[model samples]
Target: DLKTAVFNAARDGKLRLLTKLLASKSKEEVSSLISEKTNGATPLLMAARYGHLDMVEFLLEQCSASIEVGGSVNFDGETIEGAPPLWAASAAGHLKVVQSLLNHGASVNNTTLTNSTPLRAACFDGHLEIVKYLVEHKADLEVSNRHGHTCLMISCYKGHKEIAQYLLEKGADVNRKSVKGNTALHDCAESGSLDIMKMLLMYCAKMEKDGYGMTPLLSASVTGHTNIVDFLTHHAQTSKTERINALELLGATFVDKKRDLLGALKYWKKAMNMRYSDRTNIISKPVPQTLIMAYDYAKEVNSAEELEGLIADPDEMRMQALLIRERILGPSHPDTSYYIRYRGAVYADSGNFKRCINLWKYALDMQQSN
Candidate 1:
């Protein structure tokens, strides 16, 4: 008898028979019943939410049921919880239900009571096929609810790199800075995904820079990522000739963790052949200074080895640095004494201590005069 009654109500979409038998119907009933408190939903909302499309269509057509009706007032009804029919359709991945609702004038972009629209729900659930359907139905790609983020950012933040890449290829701004000044690159960097990093770099060259003057190289270095640092260094290898960018400087001193020794050698060759005005106009003449000293050191070492005896001339190493400073910096420019100290160090290392000490004293006097 109960089965007959319940099936008749369900099959005929009879609210009057099932409403009383259903106890606490959250979608329509104003009161709660302890027996049916699991969901406040009435038969109609329950059918719609679960993709029982035929039952929903029957209930709506027969009873003229309010599509806006939520669950019972006291049974944690959808009015308070806010899971609407579209949300149910999205959660169930029912394209037919979704399309039906949309054709019936359901808001395509309308966010449900839970602050998520059907489209967002579909994306969060990884229903890529349903997502495609929703998007084709004019779902907003950049839509955000109470949360301040678009679907693209959500995909990226959640490690869906392919989704973000697809969106970017579809004309999403890959470099658009977020409300926190963090771009999608920041997300990729934090994700530590080399694939995402390369993809982002391919589209946005400046993505290598982060919030605090730290480029991607700087981030990779400080985090002790030797492999990442190596890749960035190889990509940013613009240290040829007299062209050194800040990125290269930071990469050398911080990322690669090499104290500019190799860079000094490479640039020294470039700075020495630099003629006339080139020397004077060159910025950060440290390039010329350090290179000149390194070259002299190399020559001294090579010559001492060839002759099988260390050279004793502090003046030999001293002369080249002295010449460079006089030619570039100036006669009494405070840096002249710096070259004197370097000369003293070369002498000290070559085993002439007292002469090195004498040169250092001369350097002290030179410093005072300048």
Candidate 2:
């Protein structure tokens, strides 16, 4: 518990009392107690982590604590292993502590187990000052994490135009993909960063598919970012097939995720119009044998009049969300089965046992079929 006392002293930031507490120990024991971690964080690390600049300065100068020590620190409920004191300060938004740490020989390039750097951490939380400080200190901006998230990618994801602009101006790679083959464009699309996406698109990002064979336009649709989906559909360099599919999938997302039947119909109308726009080739929807009782007797509708009739029946509309989503995504995708089970679960919530059973039975068949 000798180390515990020093940590508590550091935690409390009681400089004079910590001085008195440490005065009792010899030089070897003093550095040992300050440097030794009770929980993978030394006395100085805790001080630096929480932005106790005075405590950090005193400990580093008088007690000779290690500048390199880092440990388990949770940010936004996610545990980051091997977070250096510099990383901690940047993430916590303490520019002064970061400055102090840098002046005291702390490396800005120190990374987590995920391989994310201090600059990346600062970028993740959208801290411009700390990012600039770390960048000026020679922090490797190009060193992406094990997940391959670059500082530029993270900045775009978080919708920080300021940080993203600076990173872009300073040679940040905009087209870099993650391990999942998702680029910063995919990130921006999912997170609803139209402004950042425009900057990215204007700079040098090519529309590409992810690991799931889903393009940024498809990604935007699934997220129900109408602006991004609409923007990409309008301005993004894609084929007529890609545009039609994006709108169709986007309508499906509106049906299920957004729960907006009219909005779904809006994009569905646009996509359907584009299908026969050339008067040469027209995409056709499948016609079931009969109205499926499991979907509340909902069937495929062809014309605008028949599609308008769907809004008249709320029950059919809900069922169509599940049905169209399944048709578009297929049963293999998690969302396909998830929404089916979710509809059953919702039925179960309202005490509709027979309907719930019917839906679950259908969901079970799809799962096993996959």
Candidate 3:
């Protein structure tokens, strides 16, 4: 239909033809055109997806575009559903179109059936200002898609340090896990962002193994991120148990897969220098799983004397629990405060009254700030 030429005009950036075609329509005809879908996309979706800002503006302001229109589109037969104009604009980094949609009352927190948000789209595309704008408008910070990837996860995965830092300042959870139990640190390692990894560690993100029973160090080693491998290897040396797995994984990956004997030998030697645990009952498993087992073991032990002889401090246990809860529930969950208070109790029991008081106060302050 020649009257439906607006679709091609929007897709091809033919603003003049789009405007002329749209002007010729009556109110009913224009409304019909705005409501029409070609290949599951409205004309505005076509414009926004391709970053045709002029065509998008003309459709909205001149032809009275429906800002909340919902539908899908395709590129070479891969159908993408629930990608409204805002999501389309965001995914393409079309800042002007996104701003225009926001100005026209687009919902920042709107999600598709898959839970894909405009913020996620912006972060994945590394559109920092677009992300900032959406955040300023109060988009949901922790919302993930069906894949369980928050905006912070996507930013770290794409190595967008500026946006990732901005998100962290805005209370993005560094310890938040994906559906597969991979943290932002794992994403940072896989994506080769040493700076992000350091920032996450500074925020006290614990090394929780993923569903594959792999830590950030292992993820980094797998991806050949030498800088992160070095950083985690040094950090692991502080814990007698942690260094064993760290060195073994590093040695295997670097030696067998990456073909770097010098790197492999360095870690293997460090592993040998570490002392073995006397407790043969302990099982070899992922770091998080083993930590959970240790926690359960500590719970069943008779007294503090028995526990102290075999276990790390309650401080490490409490920290691990807090990180796990934050990943599973969310950073702002009320349960998160409970673990912090538990750590405070551990501090006070150890005669560190000042530290205990400060820790509780920090938890209270975070709740109030949020």
Pairwise TM-score winner, candidates 1 and 3: 3
Question: How does each model score on TM-score?
Answer: 0.44, 0.90, 0.68
- For model 3, residues 47-162, the per-residue Cα lDDT tens digits are 88888878877777745555677678664456778878898788778888888888878888777668889999888869999999999988899989987888888888999989
Clashing pairs in 1: 26-40, 26-71, 26-72, 27-70, 27-71
Ten consecutive residues with minimal summed lDDT in candidate 2? 285-294
Task: Estimate, for each residue in 1-370, the C-alpha lDDT of model 2 and write its tens digit.
Answer: 6679889888777787788876767887787778777666777767877888899888878644477766877678877788888888888999999999888888779887788798998998899989888888888868999988789888888989999999888888887888989898988998999999999877988888887777888888877888998788877488788788788888878877877889888887887778777767777776645655668777655655666666777676677676666666666766677778778878898999899899889888888987
lDDT of each: 0.51, 0.81, 0.70
Candidate order by TM-score, decreasing, is 2, 3, 1
**Local accuracy of candidate 1 as per-residue lDDT tens digits, 1-370:** 4434544454344656665775644534322221122345454445555566666665555344345544422212424355556666675677777776666666667665546667666765456666777777887776665644566655655566666666667666665554445565555544455676677678863644434444555445333344555465567532322123322222222212343333423323333333223545543423334324322333211111222221243234334335443443343545456656766776688898876787688678767776
Clashes of each: 5, 0, 0
Give the CA lDDT, 0 to 100, for residue 171 in model 1.
67
Better of 1 and 2 by lDDT: 2
lDDT at position 222, candidate 1: 38
CA RMSD, predictions in order: 16.9, 2.7, 15.4
Superposed Cα RMSD, model 2: 2.7
